[PDB]
Amino acid sequence: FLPLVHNVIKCMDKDQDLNALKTKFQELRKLIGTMPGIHVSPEQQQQQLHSLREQVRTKNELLQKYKSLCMFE
Amino acid sequence: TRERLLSALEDLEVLSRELIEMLAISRENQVLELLIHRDGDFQELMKLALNQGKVHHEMQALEKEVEKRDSDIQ
Amino acid sequence: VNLKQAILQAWKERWSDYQWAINMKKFFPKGATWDILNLAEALLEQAMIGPSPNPLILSYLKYAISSQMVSCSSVLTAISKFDDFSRDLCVQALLDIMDMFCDRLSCHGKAEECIGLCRAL
Amino acid sequence: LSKMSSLLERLHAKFWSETIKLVRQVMEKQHLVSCLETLQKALKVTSLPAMTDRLESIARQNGLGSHLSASGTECYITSDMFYVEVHHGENPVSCPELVQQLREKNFEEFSKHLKGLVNLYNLPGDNKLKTKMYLALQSLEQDLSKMAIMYWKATNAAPLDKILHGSVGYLTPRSGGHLMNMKYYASPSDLLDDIILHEKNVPRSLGMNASVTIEGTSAMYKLPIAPLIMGSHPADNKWTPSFNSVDLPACFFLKFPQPIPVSKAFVQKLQNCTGIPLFETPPTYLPLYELITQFELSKDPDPLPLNHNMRFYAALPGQQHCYFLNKDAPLPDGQSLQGTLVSKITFQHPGRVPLILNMIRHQVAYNTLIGSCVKRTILKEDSPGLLQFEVCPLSESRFSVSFQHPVNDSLVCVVMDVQDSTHVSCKLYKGLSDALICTDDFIAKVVQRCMSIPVTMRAIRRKAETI
């Protein structure tokens, strides 16, 4: 990316918009991450995701235990 | 952490711009540090993109599952 | 017979060539009886040297016989039937080291043993 | 270390609104930047044309001028050799190894290999004597290949006999120096790895051999311009006369992988069989024992310094043994064993270099069989055991080791001399008033097959405990 542009600039000035392009790429990547969930620290996000998955699994297990083995009939 | 990745990428870009300006005004360690920073920024961006995709998938799946379970329970 | 093992150890743990006599006299009363002298040292070391002079050992023998007994050395080097061996190498160093006997002197026996020295020659 | 301070200073100086504007103003208005961009692209990804441009930039940095001929793979031509796309000669064969190395990200290895292959043709000739030297080297390589083919026809055995006797080169296709040849030295350490076969891609990287080369010497040796060795003998290597030859300041050198310790007798035999002076300059002929010690030290190239001081030790198979080199002693002739370290030999004629190489290989193999007990194993504090066999050079290429016979009460000597290139004479000097330590046949089987001094002592101890 930057190497080809640097080589082109060196061949031109042997006797472009890389900064703005990198800024736009970083802005797009940050927007896509915040849309996906990359807005806070990675370890904290992973811990929160693991906790949410554990809570969902516990809720599903509780529902299966309370629904399958019905006490009344 | 989009903030840290954006900061690393901006620092690498600034170092590259300074090195390019110095080379243009002239006719080392700075270029090596700039290249190391750019490589680290690219690796961190790839890792963060993979983690963001995984987190989005997990968040959508857990949201759907928890919504279904909570609606049934309620 | 322990003198043989002591010399073999002195080889296994090579010495400063001056503490040699110190460690040698350490294993004996050093004056009670010397009838167990080097009459077996050179023969053993060279017969096990075989096709080799076994360096770093003859130097110790010389630094000893500088002031030691000489009749035993003579009777050994005379009884050393190296003709069957005839390696043409060990006898070289043997003559080289024994030339000192005729060079300096043939010492005294202080008794009739001196006459036996004659026999040796 | 101070990179953080430099980055902070750069971030403070640059501030983007000012950086982009300054760059645009400096753009609209030497080789260091080019080298930095090439180093950056070497770590960055590159497409087919981008990889071609990177290879061209690396060749320009290396001084080689090769224009981009194809987007897939260009023909690298530089002043001595023209590798095809796929000077003084075109690409001989499609070497896939160099192509894959230069195509992969590790193009530095391919660049170094090409530079080494091209510097050989970079003789002192001014495009006229250089061409003659290249033709002479090509003819010499062709004659060596013909001799190797004749040896293979006489006995088309596996690479074992090839490393035992035959050619003195690598078993790699004809590409500049390393032509297809049989191994020179029989390295016992290369016999296995924690194991040997006559495969096409056999262990060419293994073995204490090296391919021939053309070394620029001071004496204008009469190198043959045409192929002299054309007709050989059935069980020997014969040749024919010149015409013819050229008095060039170079020769067919056979620099081996490492300078093995060679005695003065080896130097004399080499100077007799070669004619040319073995030592191009006044060589410091040091003690042969000192040369053996230096060779044993350098045999383990690593940062671990030992300085065994002629006293090594290690753990035997069922015990722990030791060894005393006992250097700096007089030889059987009456003087000290003075020698040197042989590293290269400029072979004048290619019809007799085989016997010299075989003798050097036998001497180096004997040196290896001697020094196999030399190792950086720090086995100190071993009170019980530690049978330190005193091993010193007795005769010409003969190592004599005296060890305490545990079965007997006295010592016992073992002399191993380099009888042949593979068979080494062994004599066990025991005592008349001693028990049977071992048989000569067992020692022979332990030498001609293992040839490892510490392992030899271990096997002797095992046979003594058994018998």
- Assign 3-class secondary structure to D279-321: CCCCCCCCEHHHHHHHHHHHCCCCCCCCCCCCEEEEECCCCEE
Structure tokens at D288: 């042969």
Identify which of C4, C14, C54 has the shortest CB distance to residue D402.
C54
Cα distances from D238 to residues D143, D233, D234, D276, D345, in angstroms, run: 11, 5, 9, 20, 21
**Distance from C-alpha of D345 to C-alpha of D85, rounded to nearest angstrom:** 37
Q: What is the DSSP letter of C18?
A: S
Q: Do D429 and C89 touch (CB under 8 A)?
A: no
Q: What is the DSSP letter of D190?
A: G
The position carrying tokens 């018998």 is: D467
Interface test with D, best of C1, C9, C54 (most D CBs within 10 A): C54
Structure tokens at C63: 């630094």
Identify which of D11, D27, D40 has the shortest CB distance to residue B14.
D11
**Distance from C-alpha of C10 to C-alpha of C3, rounded to nearest angstrom:** 10
Technique of determination: cryo-EM
Q: Do A19 and D23 touch (CB under 8 A)?
A: yes
Q: Do D400 and C52 touch (CB under 8 A)?
A: yes
Touch criterion met for D and C (3+ Cβ pairs within 8 Å): yes
Cα distances from D70 to residues B48, D48, D85, D155, D239, in angstroms, run: 38, 10, 7, 45, 45
Q: Do A9 and D44 touch (CB under 8 A)?
A: no
Identify which of A6, A12, A19 has the shortest CB distance to residue D40.
A6
CA-wise closest residue to B21 among A6, D357, A39: A6
Q: Do D27 and B24 touch (CB under 8 A)?
A: yes
CB atoms within 10 A of CB D384: 6
Interface test with C, best of D380, D394, D396 (most C CBs within 10 A): D394
Identify which of D16, D37, D57 has the shortest CB distance to residue A19.
D16
Alpha-carbon Rg for chain D, nearest whole angstrom, is 28
**Who's near C68: CB < 8 A, 6+ residues apart?**
C37, C38
Burial D419-455 (b: 16+ CB within 10 A, else e): bebeebebebbbbeebeebbeeebbeebbeebbbbbb
Chains with ≥3 CB–CB distances under 8 Å to D: A, B, C
Interface test with A, best of B10, B12, B14, B20 (most A CBs within 10 A): B20
Q: Which chain D residues contact residue C56 at CB under 8 A? A: 326, 329
Q: Which chain B residues contact residue A49 at CB under 8 A? A: 55, 58-59, 62
The position carrying tokens 């290597």 is: D237
Identify which of D19, D20, D41 has the shortest CB distance to residue A3.
D41
Identify which of D7, D27, D32 has the shortest CB distance to residue B33.
D7
**Distance from C-alpha of D115 to C-alpha of D108, rounded to nearest angstrom:** 10
Identify which of B11, B23, B32 has the shortest CB distance to residue D33.
B23
> D272: distance to nearest CA of chain C, Å?
28
- Counted across chains A and D, CB pairs separated by less than 8 A come out at 28
Q: Do D57 and A7 touch (CB under 8 A)?
A: yes
Q: Kindly give the interhelix angle for B29-73 and A42-67, rounded to the nearest 10 degrees.
A: 20
**Helix or strand or coil: residue D173?**
strand
Residue of A nearest to B66 (CA): A56
> A15: distance to nearest CA of chain B, Å?
8
Residue of A nearest to B3 (CA): A39
Q: Which chain D residues contact residue C8 at CB under 8 A? A: 404, 410-411
Structure tokens at D387: 């049978």
Strand D320-324 to D387-395 pairing = parallel
**Distance from C-alpha of B43 to C-alpha of B49, rounded to nearest angstrom:** 10
**Distance from C-alpha of D122 to C-alpha of D130, rounded to nearest angstrom:** 7
Q: Does B29 touch chain D (CB under 8 A)?
A: yes
CA-wise closest residue to C3 among C49, C34, C46: C34
Count of helix runs (H) and strand runs (E) in chain B = 2, 0
CA-wise closest residue to D396 among D418, D368, D371, D424: D418
Q: Does D41 touch chain A (CB under 8 A)?
A: yes
Q: Do D37 and A13 touch (CB under 8 A)?
A: no
Contact assessment for residue D220 and residue D229, using Cβ atoms and an 8 Å cutoff = no
Residue A6's identity, in one-letter code, is H
Contact assessment for residue C117 and residue C74, using Cβ atoms and an 8 Å cutoff = yes
Q: Which residues of C fall below an 8 Å CB-CB distance to D?
A: 1, 4-5, 8, 11-12, 14, 44-45, 47-56, 89, 92
Contact assessment for residue A56 and residue B65, using Cβ atoms and an 8 Å cutoff = yes
